């Protein structure tokens, strides 16, 4: 769940021939569906606070136990099963200042999944919007 | 406390030591000037220029191009990515253009952000002050919701007229200009609807639905020739230069200038309305910003081309003349509004003087620059013929 | 001199375009040049390195001559050969929707470009052509794209197979 | 006074009526060729208005510059970066610049072909975005020239671009492959494929390699560049969902998807892979793993995999993964061999790197490593030698061809990547190909692809003459911008290229 | 190019290492809120209320 | 259309008529007591206007908070800082905060005592400045509390400072020494000596020691703080010229000048010097050198030396230079001795430090060094020992006093600076002074100096209850905020302070 | 306030180039603002200085 | 003029009892008049550029050969004899963007001497303005 | 502006209670006189003379 959502989940973490042997054969030459989602948060003061005090403590523990946060150089790589929803009014409250979704997208660096807004809530989901 | 998993060549001792050991004792070239080869418009090269000029990978077969060879992939049929065949105007160099305001992206969005936030603080102040009490209800319920809100589509159509230009523009500078021009237009449209939404907020009964001014735009007597001009300039022109030129150097400079400056900002003051002139100020400021770029492009670079001057001027008279009539028709048709005005709001004498202001301005700033022989008296007369 | 932006081919064609003082001699030379050096159907590849630049330097002559010789309505609606652009446009599109395969279609479109490319035809009609023409050509080409084997496809293109590594 | 304080018109109260801004007239249609003509009345996912868009971006710029201008300049982040990477960023920034510049034009078609008002407002906003990213990449070169260790190539990248064959491809991957073709299809080629798949490793994952080698300039800029690229994806997706619901439009989806996927990854894969691993010292991870994470497992997984919504897994994936393992290794051989063309300095893989390659790419030494060792023995890093690896290619009968389609240089006698030579003759001109997909593209549509390669143009030309005509010198007029080594000692001059006599040949003349 | 004559504990490897080795494993206090004892007019504290009150 | 495009009317075009904004009337006079009556027809040396002020300052805030919130949070510059400095910045930032905050009210006097209109404008701009400076210092504490190794101290240095002896002095130097007294004198105390002499070693010099110990937050904020403190100096100097041009006002100058100088140096010189050397791992230079630079040679020669106007060198100068050499060395003993009173973690000098002090302040080891060694031997760091360096002061008969004037702690039996105990009684209360000047100040103005001292307030009180009432504890409600070691293990608790039963006693009671 | 200052700048630069000055009453101009509005300046100025003591 | 205005001129560069003696007695117990000037400029892009390409180049050679700048932490310690003038329209041209004295006043951290702005021309001097 | 100037001279210079100054300025004098001059005179009659500058 959380660890199948790691950056280096197998076959990543195999070296040399053990990696080639899996990357070059044989059912891995066709694409495999994933019910997951990737969220790239650019490193900043607002975003680190959010991850450390809302994402990892409230959202992960109470809504989505499967969200994995990895530390890259200049950004946070985040992956999860299903979706990740961020109410920005809670970030506003936690930052001690006014803050809307467009203030939030300032450091939302990338997405892999279909993302959107509705009011001040930011949603990134695996669900195909419009086909399901 | 916790330093983290990852390491950096800047902070981490081992990596930094490797990097610092590899460094030279001096730069390997004494030239820290990006775009040092770009011939500057003014005395020294600017950030605007340095970060913009030659960003389009054109080859020498497009005026000013520095690359060589043909496009790597082309349209089905063989049509090039960018080519000389997308316009009737011709140049010695397509990169000569300068926004005299030197806008690139960062200062542009900075300025607009300021205007946006101050608008928010303004509306909060205006509402809290209660100045809505000093405005005439008839002018609001009818002249702001229906007739000002219908100009929304004029600015919207004008903005979409820039669409093809964003694809076919033959340099970086013009592209940057054009986009800013059209983006100002859509901003003005939304700011008109912003005002309808605000009025719907502080005045009960006021409906912010676009239904009413849309029906005045679609099935209207006042804006019918206006919409005709807009539909034409938008969806019947395929020359990106003809599009931009005719919209800014002909249509908006006459009709747009008159509707905003010589009607709504000339008449709202007389109904106790400081609300809509607040946005019209953004509008006029935007117009006079764009005007400066439109002038540098078509007159200073194109019509004053030391090689294609008379050619460009001939084509620009062509466009000027081609589009001068749907505009006069648009104006003459708009005059049917002064009859829905309450009695003694303004007189024929004032309306005439305002028409001459727009026209004499359009002659000084546009027509004269390409040697267009316009007759102010016949224009004002042609428009006044619909003065009801 | 023999360079990229400066050779003797370009000089000669500069000193050759500097004599065309009439629109008819200009417009045909342009049309002929476009038949000689422009497409994959061209008559020669000897100017492959310099043809786009010289086409442009001939366009400039045709355009300045066409504008100086035409009125305002003709310049806006007529070719440099004297034909109704709206008619050429309407017809070529009629011809294109009557085309039966990708092969017939490409010859029509390419031909339309080789002949009526500005400053011959007005820009507006031309790009209106590109719109409808390119639409039909794409519609006919990208159907069962991978269903024709490369061996059979090289036949249809009519290419001379030179080497095939595996 | 009278009543409370509302400015109670936020962006989303204005945006509610944005869709109605469009009225029904007759010629309300797109001015571009497209076979996609389903009803496409889609909503913009990030309900932006002009001023609120400007504010958001203004905040980004606000923090972005200043970090650049105040702290990073104080920490000397432009010098304490690191030479190979300093040279690498000239290519990464300038090439991203032109890719993102063509994205403006591609958006122009997306905007023009849009049928909803929300998206026309959205797509002009996206136009502004790609104009921004242009000026951003432009700023990275600007800063690195102004404060860095070698400004040459950073300062004139836009014309020194023109000497090398890597540039020619860059004008096709995220550019001519976007703008020159179908307009509605740009939802696929620009957005479903380009900005949804390849922007991540190219703009996000590069920052890691940047930070590993002391660059804190690139992370601040690129990580803000990508912030925009996510709203782009979602709006493109909505055009995609429209297509896939119309039986008459879904039929075109798979081939165009595949045609797009190959078009980009053909250049993306060997060029970014080689920039990461050969343009750096500290590696973050193998490029295949980056390619397997972002492209194969996540993009393909969460996008292409999810759609099935009959959308197919690309036919050319098998070849791509192979290119993901070898193409970037194949290409540095060429790039380092053709070093006197680029606008940047290149370096030989040192000992620790050769071990790293061999450890993660079994077979690397026996093939590539020995070649670099021989080149080192011949004195490729020494101006007094009179040797360039290009000479070795000729001596050992190893021709280098340029794909008529992708413009990617290749050497079929040495390639371990999924490339296979094909030579044809049509109307008195010979065309070379490196794969089945490209050759199929040219076979069907030979009028799209007539791009003269570096050999056709420089045929019969002496190398130094081309380098000097295109201003590949430095401020003294003697020294080259390009170098086979990365040190600041014993640099190659023009008279050192003229010392030897490398005159170009069009390789197809051999047939 | 040229990296001056003054060194930093953030950049310089020799000093940075000293600093790094001297650091704790975790913060010596989990209360990272400046002005946590300050009364909040609204449910949550603000920067306004933090940077200002009790100065 | 119209004519040209002037927005024309910048700052200096409205400012031309600012001086004409005041009109004559009867009560157009200061509300504050002042012995300076001369005319301030002074021109604001910076033609400032409220909107251009806000603009310029906004630009600074743009880059400053940008660097802070973006790049430095990505480099973890709040963590990669030497633990000693992390503690030092709790005092430096918060003390400077109150210094600047008091400068608001001081400027409020200068604004009220001003006669020129341009200076009423300028002094509200200066008031605003010290408001920014207030929020900036607070922000350094704010950042280091939220992103650092020990938020304790940073998170409550506005109620935990009330326990210490050093805080009392602070509420005078750059505080009451400004706002309590003559209004037109603040041109001398706040500006001619405050902002013109001490804000350089207190804001500019600190940034060097901050960078030395891995801190790039303080230089970012502080260097942006001082940027305003020059328009102050000039706009204060203008009032000085007025005073020096009036023979009836120039008669008070040298007295006010010298008094302000000593008042400030008495706490500035030792506290800050001891903050630098005993609060940093990496030293920039000896404090005497910093002091000799900015104070004696620069500010002395540039301002005071040049004014001879008819201004004199301070009489207390020789005593002041003596305090430069030893007073800070004298104060860390006391400060370390009274470590449980603080809101920050102190540490013994290690070996290099021990020999760096002797290398630069010869005689150091035989005096201070062997005391520190004895203290470690007694177990001053070990919570099990039951030892606090105050006990050594008792055992060896070294009474610690607090000045009635400056509030600075001093131990005369050990002192090597210019401290000389003087005890007086007057109406049933005894008073301790350490210098000629301070005691003269009290002898002339005993109604000004009535500040109770640490031993007076806590008389007969057990240290644990004092600490516990003033909330000198951490989140657990057990462990002390302050520690005698900068390490992270084996920290002192309430019990560790209650166990050794230290009860405060009035030293003066011993006479 | 900086935002207000710069938009003010842009506004004036636009107003002056847009020639809206022509529609403005000459009597209300050189009399009712030059003299009677320009005198409220001092009202606000005195009102400004009525804060010097509260600082 | 450049080592004379060095940060470490006598009695700096003396340490131990080499310092203490000349520091404690006895002409040095009185303030000594200085014709110099001290400018502190915050380390940023614009300041470095003006220092590298205007201050050290044309100014130091054609106007004031006594200007000595030294590297510190995050600022430049500049010291010259008499005065230093900064034409900010000159800077504006060099940067390629709009720049006044107030844009320049962003990064001038401190001053020892009298400072003032005459339009867009910032000057700092040792002259006592109004009583000299 | 006679009585207005007199009130201003008073508020400014004849009050030493900082709370009295600020309150009487903003809660009495400006909230009545200032609000009338600014809103119910100039920014109500100015538009009637073709002035958008002052508003
Ligand atoms: Fe982009
Ligand atoms: Fe994009
Ligand atoms: Fe201050
Ligand atoms: Fe101050």
- Map out the domains of chain D as residue ranges: 1-511
Widest CA span in chain C: 62
Residue B262 to residue F11: CA distance in whole angstroms? 32
Residue H64 to residue H81: CA distance in whole angstroms? 8
Q: Give the chains touching H; criterion: ≥3 Cβ pairs < 8 Å.
A: B, D, E, F
Other beta carbons within 10 angstroms of residue A47's beta carbon come to: 22
Secondary structure element (H or E) that encloses residue H114, with its range? strand H114-117
> Which one from F137, F186, F197, F380 is the annotated catalytic residue?
F137
> CB distance G47–I25 less than 8 Å?
yes
Gap from CA of B81 to ligand 1 centroid (Å): 18
Closest CA to F250 of F307, F202, F297: F307
Method: X-ray
Other beta carbons within 10 angstroms of residue D391's beta carbon come to: 16
CB nearest B285 (choices: G2, G4, G14): G14
Please list every residue in chain E whose beta carbon sits closer than 8 Å to the beta carbon of residue D149. 1
Closest CA to D158 of B37, B94, C52: B37
Please list every residue in chain D whose beta carbon sits closer than 8 Å to the beta carbon of residue H45. 68-70, 73, 146-147
Q: Are residues C136 and C102 in the same domain?
A: yes
**In the structure, do chain H and chain G come into contact, i.e. share 3 or more CB pairs under 8 Å?**
no
The verdict on whether residue D133 carries a ligand-binding annotation is: yes
- The catalytic site residues of D sit at 137
Q: Which domains does chain H have, with CATH numbers?
A: 1-132 (3.90.56.10)
Other beta carbons within 10 angstroms of residue B116's beta carbon come to: 24
Q: To the nearest whole angstrom, how far is the Cα of B8 from the nearest Cα of chain F?
A: 8
Q: Give the chains touching B; criterion: ≥3 Cβ pairs < 8 Å.
A: A, C, D, E, F, G, H, I
Please list every residue in chain I whose beta carbon sits closer than 8 Å to the beta carbon of residue B269. 46-48, 50-52
Q: Give the chains touching E; criterion: ≥3 Cβ pairs < 8 Å.
A: A, B, D, F, H
Residue D154 to residue D141: CA distance in whole angstroms? 5
Please list every residue in chain E whose beta carbon sits closer than 8 Å to the beta carbon of residue H72. 6
| Angle at C111 (CA atoms; ends C108, C115), nearest 5 degrees | 140
In the beta sheet, which residues pair with residue C161? D424
Residue B192 to residue B259: CA distance in whole angstroms? 13
Residue A23 to residue A7: CA distance in whole angstroms? 16
Number of domains in chain B: 1
Structural contact between residues B106 and D61, judged by C-beta atoms closer than 8 angstroms: yes
* B4 interfaces chain D, CB cutoff of 8 Å: no
Q: To the nearest whole angstrom, how far is the Cα of E9 from the nearest Cα of chain D?
A: 11
> CB distance C42–D456 less than 8 Å?
no
As a three-state string, the secondary structure of chain B is: CCCCCCCCCCCCHHHHHHHHHHCCCCCCCCCCCCCCCCCCCCCCCCHHHHCCCCCCCCECCCCCCCECCCCCCCCCCCCCCCCHHHCCCCCCCCCCCCCCCCCCHHHHHHHHHHHHHHHHHHHHHHHHHCHHHHCCHHHHHHHHCCCCCCHHHHHHHHHHCCCCHHHHCCCHHHHHHHHHHHHHHHHHHHHHHHHHHHHHHHCCCCCCCCHHHHHHHHCCCCCHHHHHHHHHHHHCCCCHHHHHHHHHHHHHHHHHHHHHHHHHHHHHHHHCCCCHHHHHHHHHHHHHHHHHHHHHHHHHHHHCCCCCHHHHHHHHHHHHHHHHHHHHHHHHHHHHHCCCCCCCCCCHHHHHHHHHHHHHHHHHHCHHHHCCCCCHHHHHHHHHCCCC
Gap from CA of B113 to ligand 2 centroid (Å): 22
CB nearest D216 (choices: F62, F69, F71): F71
Measured CA to CA in angstroms, residue H117 lies from D382, F118, H88, H122 at distances of 56, 15, 10, 5
**In the structure, do chain I and chain A come into contact, i.e. share 3 or more CB pairs under 8 Å?**
no
Residues in chain D whose C lies over 2.5 Å from the next residue's N (breaks after): 308
Q: Give the chains touching I; criterion: ≥3 Cβ pairs < 8 Å.
A: B, F, G
Tokens linked to D292: 């397997």
Please list every residue in chain E whose beta carbon sits closer than 8 Å to the beta carbon of residue F101. 55
Structural contact between residues B82 and B171, judged by C-beta atoms closer than 8 angstroms: no
Q: What is the dihedral of CA F493, F498, F499, F503, to 10 degrees?
A: 140
CB nearest F83 (choices: E15, E22, E51): E22
Indicate the SS3 state at residue H110.
strand
Gap from CA of D194 to ligand 1 centroid (Å): 10
Chain I residue set in contact with G, beta carbons under 8 Å = 1, 4-5, 8-9, 11-12, 15-16, 18-19, 21-22, 25, 29-30, 34, 37-38, 42, 46, 49-54
**In the structure, do chain F and chain B come into contact, i.e. share 3 or more CB pairs under 8 Å?**
yes
Residue D117 to residue D374: CA distance in whole angstroms? 62
Please list every residue in chain F whose beta carbon sits closer than 8 Å to the beta carbon of residue A48. 73
The verdict on whether residue F195 carries a ligand-binding annotation is: yes
> CB distance A71–B5 less than 8 Å?
yes
**Nearest bound ligand to the CA of residue D96:** 1
CB nearest B11 (choices: E10, E14, E25): E10
Find tokens 């253009």 and name the residue.
Answer: B97
* D75 interfaces chain E, CB cutoff of 8 Å: yes
In a 13 Å sphere around the CA of E19, the CA atoms on its Cβ side amount to: 34
Q: Are residues C16 and C46 in the same domain?
A: yes
Q: Which residue of I has its CA nearest to F29?
A: I13
Residue C150, phi then psi, degrees to nearest 5 = -60, -30
Please list every residue in chain D whose beta carbon sits closer than 8 Å to the beta carbon of residue E4. 76
Measured CA to CA in angstroms, residue A104 lies from A44, A126, D221 at distances of 11, 21, 17
Residue B83 to residue B95: CA distance in whole angstroms? 14
Structural contact between residues B331 and B255, judged by C-beta atoms closer than 8 angstroms: yes
| Angle at H97 (CA atoms; ends H94, H99), nearest 5 degrees | 85
Closest CA to B133 of B275, B281, B279, B280: B275
* B132 interfaces chain D, CB cutoff of 8 Å: yes
Residue E26 to residue I7: CA distance in whole angstroms? 62
CA B24 from chain centre, in angstroms, equals 49
> CB distance B361–F1 less than 8 Å?
yes
Tell me the Ramachandran region of residue D120: left when phi exceeds 0, alpha when psi lies from -120 to 50, beta otherwise.
alpha
Gap from CA of F225 to ligand 4 centroid (Å): 9
Secondary structure element (H or E) that encloses residue F169, with its range? helix F166-171
Indicate the SS3 state at residue F399.
coil
Other beta carbons within 10 angstroms of residue B21's beta carbon come to: 7
In the beta sheet, which residues pair with residue H69? H78
Structural contact between residues B327 and B379, judged by C-beta atoms closer than 8 angstroms: no
Domain harbouring C32, CATH code: 1.20.1280.10
CB nearest A74 (choices: D211, D241, D298): D211
**In the structure, do chain B and chain D come into contact, i.e. share 3 or more CB pairs under 8 Å?**
yes
The verdict on whether residue F232 carries a ligand-binding annotation is: yes
**Nearest bound ligand to the CA of residue F190:** 4
CA B64 from chain centre, in angstroms, equals 25
Chosen for mutation from F6, F22, F25 (greatest number of chain I CBs closer than 10 Å) is: F25
Secondary structure element (H or E) that encloses residue H121, with its range? strand H121-125
Chain B residue set in contact with E, beta carbons under 8 Å = 1-3, 10-14, 16-17, 20, 23-27
Tell whether domain F1-511 is in CATH 1.10.620.20: yes
Annotated active-site residue F451? The verdict is no
> CB distance G51–I22 less than 8 Å?
yes
Domain residue limits at C25? 2-69
**What is the length of chain D?**
511
> CB distance D245–A131 less than 8 Å?
yes
Tell me the Ramachandran region of residue B171: left when phi exceeds 0, alpha when psi lies from -120 to 50, beta otherwise.
beta
> CB distance E12–B16 less than 8 Å?
yes
């Amino acid at each position: 769940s959380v660890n199948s959502n790691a950056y280096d989940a197998g076959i990543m973490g195999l070296k040399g021939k053990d990696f080639a042997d899996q990357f070059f054969a044989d059912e891995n030459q066709v694409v495999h569906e994933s019910d997951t989602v990737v969220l790239v948060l650019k490193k900043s003061d607002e975003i680190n606070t959010f991850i450390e005090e809302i994402l990892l403590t409230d959202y992960k523990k109470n809504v989505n136990p499967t969200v994995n946060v990895e530390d890259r150089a200049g950004y946070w790589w985040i992956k999860a099963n299903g979706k990740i929803e961020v109410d920005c009014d809670e970030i506003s409250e936690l930052l001690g200042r006014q803050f809307n979704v467009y203030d939030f997208l300032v450091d939302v660096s990338s997405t892999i999944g279909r993302a959107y807004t509705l009011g001040n809530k930011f949603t990134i989901t695996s669900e195909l919007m419009g086909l399901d | 406390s916790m330093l983290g998993e990852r390491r950096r060549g800047l902070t981490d001792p081992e990596m930094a030591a490797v990097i610092l050991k590899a460094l030279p004792e001096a730069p390997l070239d004494g030239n820290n000037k990006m775009g040092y080869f770009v011939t500057p418009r003014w005395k020294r090269l600017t950030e605007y220029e340095a970060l913009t000029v030659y960003a389009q990978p054109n080859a020498d077969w497009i005026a000013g191009g520095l690359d060589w060879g043909d496009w790597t992939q082309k349209f089905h049929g063989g049509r090039p990515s960018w080519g000389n065949e997308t316009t009737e105007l011709r140049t010695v160099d397509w990169f000569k253009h300068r926004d005299p305001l030197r806008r690139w992206h960062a200062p542009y969005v900075k300025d607009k952000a300021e205007e946006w936030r101050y608008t928010d603080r303004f509306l909060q102040g205006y509402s809290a002050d209660g100045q809505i009490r000093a405005m005439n209800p008839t002018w609001r319920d009818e002249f702001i919701n229906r007739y000002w809100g219908a100009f929304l589509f004029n600015e919207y159509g004008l903005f979409n007229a820039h669409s093809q230009g964003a694809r076919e523009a033959l340099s970086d500078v013009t592209r940057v200009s054009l986009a800013f021009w059209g983006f100002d237009k859509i901003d003005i449209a939304q700011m008109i609807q912003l005002e309808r939404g605000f009025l719907a907020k502080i005045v009960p009964g006021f409906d912010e639905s676009t239904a009413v001014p849309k029906a005045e735009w679609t099935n209207g007597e006042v804006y019918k020739s206006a919409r005709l001009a807009v539909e034409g300039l938008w969806q019947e022109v395929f020359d990106w230069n003809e599009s931009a030129f005719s919209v800014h150097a002909v249509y908006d400079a006459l009709f747009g200038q008159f509707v905003r400056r010589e009607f709504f900002q000339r008449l709202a003051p007389r109904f106790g309305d400081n609300l809509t002139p607040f946005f019209i100020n953004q509008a006029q400021t935007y117009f006079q910003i764009a005007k400066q770029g439109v002038q540098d492009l078509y007159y200073n670079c194109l019509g004053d081309d030391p090689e294609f001057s008379d050619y460009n001027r001939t084509v620009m008279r062509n466009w000027t003349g081609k589009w001068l009539e749907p505009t006069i028709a648009a104006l003459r048709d708009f005059m049917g509004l002064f009859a829905k005005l309450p009695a003694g709001t303004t007189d024929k004498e004032e309306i005439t003087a305002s028409l001459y202001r727009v026209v004499d301005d359009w002659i000084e700033d546009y027509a004269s620059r390409i040697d267009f022989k316009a007759d102010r008296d016949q224009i004002v007369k042609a428009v006044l013929a619909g003065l009801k | 001199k023999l360079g990229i932006h400066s050779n003797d081919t370009r000089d000669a064609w500069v000193n050759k375009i500097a004599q065309l003082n009439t629109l008819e001699k200009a417009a045909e030379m342009l049309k002929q040049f476009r038949m000689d050096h422009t497409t994959p159907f061209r008559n020669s590849y000897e100017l492959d390195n310099d043809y786009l630049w010289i086409e442009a330097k001939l366009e400039e002559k045709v355009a300045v001559l066409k504008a100086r010789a035409f009125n305002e309505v003709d310049f806006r609606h007529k070719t440099a050969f004297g034909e109704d652009a709206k008619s050429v446009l309407d017809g070529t599109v009629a011809k294109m929707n009557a085309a039966k395969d990708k092969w017939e279609a490409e010859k029509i479109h390419i031909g339309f470009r080789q002949a009526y490319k500005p400053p011959i035809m007005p820009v507006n009609y031309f790009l209106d052509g590109e719109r409808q023409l390119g639409t039909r050509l794409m519609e006919l080409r990208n159907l069962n794209y991978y269903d024709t084997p490369l061996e059979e496809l090289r036949k249809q293109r009519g290419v001379r197979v030179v080497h095939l590594q595996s | 006074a009278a009543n409370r304080a509302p400015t109670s018109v936020n962006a989303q109260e204005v945006h509610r009526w944005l869709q109605s801004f469009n009225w029904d007239f007759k010629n309300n249609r797109t001015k571009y060729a497209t076979k996609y003509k389903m009803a496409n009345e889609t909503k913009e996912q990030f309900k932006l208005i002009a001023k609120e868009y400007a504010r958001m971006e203004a905040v980004k710029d606000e923090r972005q510059f200043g970090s650049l201008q105040d702290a990073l300049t104080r920490l000397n982040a432009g010098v304490r970066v690191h030479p190979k990477w300093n040279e690498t960023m000239k290519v990464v920034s300038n090439f991203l610049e032109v890719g993102e510049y063509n994205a403006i034009a591609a958006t122009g078609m997306l905007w023009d072909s849009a049928q909803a008002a929300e998206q026309k407002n959205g797509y002009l906003a996206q136009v502004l975005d790609e104009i921004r990213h242009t000026h951003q990449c432009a700023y990275v070169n600007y800063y690195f020239a102004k404060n860095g260790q070698d400004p040459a190539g950073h300062n004139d990248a836009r014309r020194t671009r023109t000497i090398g064959p890597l540039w020619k491809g860059m004008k096709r991957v995220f550019s001519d492959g976007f703008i020159s073709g179908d307009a509605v299809e740009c939802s696929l080629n620009l957005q479903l494929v380009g900005e949804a798949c390849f922007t991540n490793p190219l703009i996000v994952a590069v920052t890691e390699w940047a930070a590993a080698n002391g660059d804190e300039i690139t992370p601040t800029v690129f990580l803000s560049i990508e912030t925009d690229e996510l709203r782009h994806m979602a709006n493109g997706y909505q055009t995609v969902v429209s297509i896939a619901n119309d039986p008459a439009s879904a039929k075109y989806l798979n081939t165009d998807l595949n045609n797009a996927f190959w078009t980009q990854q053909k250049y993306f894969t060997p060029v970014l892979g080689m920039l990461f691993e050969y343009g750096s010292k500290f590696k973050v991870e193998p490029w295949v793993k980056t390619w397997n994470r972002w492209v194969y497992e996540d993009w393909g997984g969460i996008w292409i995999g999810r759609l099935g919504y009959g959308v197919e897994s690309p036919r050319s994936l098998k070849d791509a993964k192979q290119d993901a393992y070898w193409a970037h290794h194949d290409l540095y051989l060429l790039a380092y061999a053709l070093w006197p063309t680029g606008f940047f300095r290149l370096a030989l893989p040192d000992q620790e790197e050769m071990e790293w390659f061999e450890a993660n790419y079994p077979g690397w030494y026996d093939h590539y490593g020995k070649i670099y060792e021989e080149w080192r023995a011949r004195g490729c890093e020494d101006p007094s030698s009179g040797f360039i690896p290009l000479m070795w290619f000729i001596e050992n009968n190893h021709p280098i061809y340029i794909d008529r389609v992708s413009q990617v240089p290749f050497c079929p006698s040495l390639a371990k990547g999924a490339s296979t030579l094909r030579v044809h003759e049509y109307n008195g001109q010979m065309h070379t190909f490196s794969d089945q997909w490209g050759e199929r593209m040219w076979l069907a549509e030979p009028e799209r692809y007539e791009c003269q390669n570096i050999f056709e143009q420089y045929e019969g030309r002496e190398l130094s003459e081309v380098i000097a005509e295109l201003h590949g010198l430095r401020s003294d007029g003697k020294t080259l911008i390009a170098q086979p080594h990365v040190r600041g000692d014993k640099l190659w001059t023009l008279d050192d290229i003229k010392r030897l006599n490398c005159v170009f040949k069009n390789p197809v003349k051999a047939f």
